[PDB]
Design a protein around this ligand. Structure first.
Ligand SMILES: Nc1nc2c(ncn2[C@@H]2O[C@H](COP(=O)(O)OP(=O)(O)NP(=O)(O)Nc3ccc(C(=O)c4ccccc4)cc3N)[C@@H](O)[C@H]2O)c(=O)[nH]1
Ligand SMILES: [Mg+2]
Length: 160
């Protein structure tokens, strides 16, 4: 069957794992590869997701997994301005290693259940527009937009 190699990236603590675990095991963790047969738009397929460590110890450790990844979830948290500003560094790294200005990618603003937000939706939407990539807000806690984000990424890969 078609397999989709997806890679979840982002600054420490933004909810890369919570999003992956909500999708795969259907529960929010208040506190690494995953493989799952799913059916998306009638297509039977396997999601092979890499949930990357947050520690900036990489760049040679990062290049290996970015090279095999087909599409990328670039995650920041909406109560975390630094995690948002860090997004540019992740995209420029994916582009460097994949020798492409166009890589299937979705910008995800996670933790949209929280009221104490420091990054506004219009801000991130305008960023995503400049990249030419979709923007989707999620909450791994409420499960809002979780399937949305991953499925939109699969569809971006299908259109590449
Ligand atoms: N209210 C919300 N909290 C969220 C959410 N996602 C994560 N979390 C919480 O944020 C904390 C960190 O989440 P998580 O470990 O899933 O993030 P990361 O994978 O990015 N951490 P890391 O691997 O970079 N590790 C250091 C942890 O306490 C979660 O329960 C969410 O949607 N809303
Ligand atoms: Mg994690």
């Amino acid at each position: 069957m078609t397999e989709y190699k997806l890679v979840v990236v982002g600054a420490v603590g933004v909810g890369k794992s919570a999003l992956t675990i909500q999708l795969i095991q259907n529960h929010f963790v208040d506190e690494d590869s995953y493989r799952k047969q799913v059916v998306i738009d009638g297509e039977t397929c396997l999601l092979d997701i890499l949930d990357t460590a947050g520690q900036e110890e990489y760049s040679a450790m990062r290049d290996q997994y970015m090279r095999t990844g087909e599409g990328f979830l670039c995650v920041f948290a909406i109560n975390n301005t630094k995690s948002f500003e860090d997004i540019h560094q992740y995209r420029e790294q994916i582009k460097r290693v994949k020798d492409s200005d166009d890589v299937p990618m979705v910008l995800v603003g996670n933790k949209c259940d929280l009221a104490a937000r420091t990054v506004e939706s219009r801000q991130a939407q305008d960023l995503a527009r400049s990249y030419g990539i979709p923007y989707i807000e999620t909450s791994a806690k409420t499960r809002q937009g979780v399937e949305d984000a991953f499925y939109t990424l699969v569809r971006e890969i299908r259109q590449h």
